[PDB]
Amino acid sequence: DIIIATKNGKVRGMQLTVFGGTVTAFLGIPYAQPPLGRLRFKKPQSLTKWSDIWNATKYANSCCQNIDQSFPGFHGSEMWNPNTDLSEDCLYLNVWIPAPKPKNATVLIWIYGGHFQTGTSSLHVYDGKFLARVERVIVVSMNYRVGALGFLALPGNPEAPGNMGLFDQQLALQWVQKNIAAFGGNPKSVTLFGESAGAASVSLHLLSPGSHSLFTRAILQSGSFNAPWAVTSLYEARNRTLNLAKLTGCSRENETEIIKCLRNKDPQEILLNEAFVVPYGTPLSVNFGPTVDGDFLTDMPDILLELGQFKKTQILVGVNKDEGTAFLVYGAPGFSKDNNSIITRKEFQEGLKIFFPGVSEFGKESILFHYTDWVDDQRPENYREALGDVVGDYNFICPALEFTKKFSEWGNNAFFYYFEHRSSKLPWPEWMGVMHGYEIEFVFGLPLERRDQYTKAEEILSRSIVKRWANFAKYGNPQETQNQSTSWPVFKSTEQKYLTLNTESTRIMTKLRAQQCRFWTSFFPKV
Numbered sequence: 235d236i237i238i239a240t241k242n243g244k245v246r247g248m249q250l251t252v253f254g255g256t257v258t259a260f261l262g263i264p265y266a267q268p269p270l271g272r273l274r275f276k277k278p279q280s281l282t283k284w285s286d287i288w289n290a291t292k293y294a295n296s297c298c299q300n301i302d303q304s305f306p307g308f309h310g311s312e313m314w315n316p317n318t319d320l321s322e323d324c325l326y327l328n329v330w331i332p333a334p335k336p337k338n339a340t341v342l343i344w345i346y347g348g349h350f351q352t353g354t355s356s357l358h359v360y361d362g363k364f365l366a367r368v369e370r371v372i373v374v375s376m377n378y379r380v381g382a383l384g385f386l387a388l389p390g391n392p393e394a395p396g397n398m399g400l401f402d403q404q405l406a407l408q409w410v411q412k413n414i415a416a417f418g419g420n421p422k423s424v425t426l427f428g429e430s431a432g433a434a435s436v437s438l439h440l441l442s443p444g445s446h447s448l449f450t451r452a453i454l455q456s457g458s459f460n461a462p463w464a465v466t467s468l469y470e471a472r473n474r475t476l477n478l479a480k481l482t483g484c485s486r487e488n489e490t491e492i493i494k495c496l497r498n499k500d501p502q503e504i505l506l507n508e509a510f511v512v513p514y515g516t517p518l519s520v521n522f523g524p525t526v527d528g529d530f531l532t533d534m535p536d537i538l539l540e541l542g543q544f545k546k547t548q549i550l551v552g553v554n555k556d557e558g559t560a561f562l563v564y565g566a567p568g569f570s571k572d573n574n575s576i577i578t579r580k581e582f583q584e585g586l587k588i589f590f591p592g593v594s595e596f597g598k599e600s601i602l603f604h605y606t607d608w609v610d611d612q613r614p615e616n617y618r619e620a621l622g623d624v625v626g627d628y629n630f631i632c633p634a635l636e637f638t639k640k641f642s643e644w645g646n647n648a649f650f651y652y653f654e655h656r657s658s659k660l661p662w663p664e665w666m667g668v669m670h671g672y673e674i675e676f677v678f679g680l681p682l683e684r685r686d687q688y689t690k691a692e693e694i695l696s697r698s699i700v701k702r703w704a705n706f707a708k709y710g711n712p713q714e715t716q717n718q719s720t721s722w723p724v725f726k727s728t729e730q731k732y733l734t735l736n737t738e739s740t741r742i743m744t745k746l747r748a749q750q751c752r753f754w755t756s757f758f759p760k761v
């Protein structure tokens with residue numbers, strides 16, 4: 235019997251066998267009052283408190299969300315879909331602890347992505363037991379509200395203030411500060427890590443003064459709040475809430491009455507209608523996401539980043555080589571995960587229209603001019619490759635590099651990586667290369683499980699990334715010091731060094747996508 239006394243009452247865990255040892259897991263500990271009825275759209279309230287034992291022995295409900303139904307039966311897409319029941323009653327977190335119980339372990343808190351509209355902490359690729367077993371860190375992960383239920387905003391109105399899902403995350407951090415010591419964790423050694431919308435969340439926790447004392451350091455995998463899809467304007471946010479109201483027959487003149495009507499709607503009606511609030515979205519559109527609320531975020535985050543108003547600490551930031559390809563099969567013409575997707579110039583042009591619906595003819599022309607300087611060949615896959623790079627550079631790579639540059643200008647150590655290894659198991663086809671989302675399994679150490687038929691070179695690579703990430707968490711420095719590795723240099727503006735992660739040549743390079751990012755970061759905002 236593994237019973238731990240938390241601030242709120244006792245919880246029961248279970249033991250797992252992992253690589254010839256044990257990890258103790260507590261799956262599904264509640265951390266907030268379930269946000270139902272009148273609590274829908276509100277900030278999470280603190281937990282009622284209980285005597286007797288809460289059994290934390292299975293993953294909890296995932297938050298309400300629309301499911302990816304694009305490729306039924308296909309593992310490449312369905313692996314991302316939730317794997318417990320959907321419920322509004324979903325504010326639970328998970329804790330993996332090394333055995334024997336550690337004395338004062340560093341804690342890593344994972345925040346999932348899913349574009350702020352989907353995701354859950356229970357996915358197989360987010361299973362923290364390997365990290366716990368291999369590096370003797372404590373791993374924690376939480377479910378937080380997404381879509382309208384988590385991000386619906388009528389700014390200043392505490393019935394629906396915005397950022398509720400970011401506040402769920404923050405309450406989970408607070409839970410760790412208050413309880414992790416009872417589990418053998420060090421509340422003073424907490425690293426946040428997250429991928430995509432989860433990495434954008436981690437970066438907003440660097441900006442939010444309520445989060446400042448709830449963590450030490452931060453790891454941003456393929457995302458940051460300055461990505462163009464990650465923060466919603468207050469004009470866009472109100473238009474969208476108003477639209478959702480109209481769509482559900484919930485339009486009233488009293489802002490407060492609207493929320494009351496929305497609170498009487500069942501979650502399916504809200505979910506069904508979220509897709510249609512943006513008047514024309516793209517495959518990267520965020521219907522309801524982070525807003526400037528005067529609470530979690532006290533000002534536009536670009537202004538805070540530029541003027542140095544953020545927690546001074548070390549960061550670890552990186553991207554994958556083909557960030558953009560995953561999105562091409564969710565609406566660009568001529569693209570398919572079942573053939574080689576060789577597209578013409580014409581299709582390339584129509585694909586720009588899908589990703590850049592608001593942009594002038596001049597603006598799309600200058601994207602094309604910039605990305606079609608073939609040295610060389612011509613060379614059938616030229617346009618297919620160009621569109622993936624457009625989408626990946628504009629949405630993920632140039633913003634992560636810009637985030638890292640601006641952050642490091644205020645004198646902290648930053649480390650940047652470029653992940654270029656394509657999983658031997660990737661279910662998506664070869665043309666999609668090193669996709670968005672597919673470093674996660676290496677970070678969580680899935681290729682260390684030799685029963686799983688990743689390659690030896692993959693086990694070596696993951697073992698090494700697990701060590702770098704644990705070293706950054708524990709010591710603020712992501713070295714692998716023992717195996718004659720490449721030293722990871724700090725990223726500074728000026729040299730802008732970064733490390734590549736792959737199975738052969740890990741190397742130090744500079745100025746990733748220099749020409750492309752000058753285009754997106756400085757020229758494109760003007761068109």
Ligand SMILES: *[C@@H]1O[C@H](CO[C@H]2O[C@@H](C)[C@@H](O)[C@@H](O)[C@@H]2O)[C@@H](O[C@@H]2O[C@H](CO)[C@@H](O)[C@H](O)[C@H]2NC(C)=O)[C@H](O)[C@H]1NC(C)=O
Nearest residue numbers: 563564565566567568569570571572573574575576577581
């Ligand atoms: C690669 O496939 C695309 C995708 O559409 C197709 O899915 C395929 C697996 C295929 O079996 C086909 O039946 C299905 O329509 C092909 O583009 C499609 O081409 C046709 C015109 O022939 C259009 O009617 C479709 O709208 C268009 N699809 C999309 C999403 O735009 C594509 O040509 C094929 N590419 C090759 C062979 O290079």
Ligand SMILES: *[C@H]1O[C@H](CO[C@H]2O[C@@H](C)[C@@H](O)[C@@H](O)[C@@H]2O)[C@@H](O[C@@H]2O[C@H](CO)[C@@H](O)[C@H](O)[C@H]2NC(C)=O)[C@H](O)[C@H]1NC(C)=O
Nearest residue numbers: 469470472473474476477478480481509510511512513514
């Ligand atoms: C937000 O306000 C209006 C409302 O438009 C939305 O109404 C919803 C109920 C939903 O059906 C959604 O598709 C629709 O967009 C926007 O007006 C739209 O956009 C243009 C304006 O020139 C028009 O073509 C339509 O009147 C309307 N769209 C559709 C598809 O019918 C308005 O643009 C938007 N506000 C912004 C962008 O700030």
Ligand SMILES: *[C@@H]1O[C@H](CO[C@H]2O[C@@H](C)[C@@H](O)[C@@H](O)[C@@H]2O)[C@@H](O)[C@H](O)[C@H]1NC(C)=O
Nearest residue numbers: 337338340420421422423424450707708709
């Ligand atoms: C556990 O270690 C505590 C502090 O260690 C941390 O100090 C911070 C500066 C930060 O760097 C962390 O990463 C360091 O690990 C110490 O204060 C506590 O007393 C310890 N508690 C124990 C051993 O039970």
Ligand SMILES: *[C@@H]1O[C@H](CO)[C@@H](O)[C@H](O)[C@H]1NC(C)=O
Nearest residue numbers: 246247248287288289290291
């Ligand atoms: C919790 O855990 C154990 C099963 O391992 C059991 O003895 C007890 O009934 C449980 N309490 C429940 C299910 O409420």
Ligand SMILES: *[C@@H]1O[C@H](CO)[C@@H](O)[C@H](O)[C@H]1NC(C)=O
Nearest residue numbers: 486487488489490491492494
């Ligand atoms: C609108 O309705 C709410 C809820 O009953 C009320 O408290 C509020 O004061 C009203 N405001 C206006 C301006 O009518």
Ligand SMILES: *[C@@H]1O[C@H](CO)[C@@H](O)[C@H](O)[C@H]1NC(C)=O
Nearest residue numbers: 694697698699701714716717
């Ligand atoms: C370092 O080297 C050996 C292989 O010679 C291996 O057993 C060990 O896991 C490696 N450690 C890391 C952290 O990569």
Ligand SMILES: [Cl-]
Nearest residue numbers: 317356357358
């Ligand atoms: Cl599963």
Ligand SMILES: [Cl-]
Nearest residue numbers: 467468469526
């Ligand atoms: Cl704004």
Ligand SMILES: [Cl-]
Nearest residue numbers: 555556623654
């Ligand atoms: Cl490249």
Ligand SMILES: [Cl-]
Nearest residue numbers: 579580583602
């Ligand atoms: Cl042309």
Ligand SMILES: [Cl-]
Nearest residue numbers: 718719720740
């Ligand atoms: Cl190396």
Ligand SMILES: [Cl-]
Nearest residue numbers: 728729744745
């Ligand atoms: Cl250089």
Ligand SMILES: [Cl-]
Nearest residue numbers: 745746747748
């Ligand atoms: Cl490059």
Ligand code: NA
Nearest residue numbers: 596600603757
């Ligand atoms: Na020009």
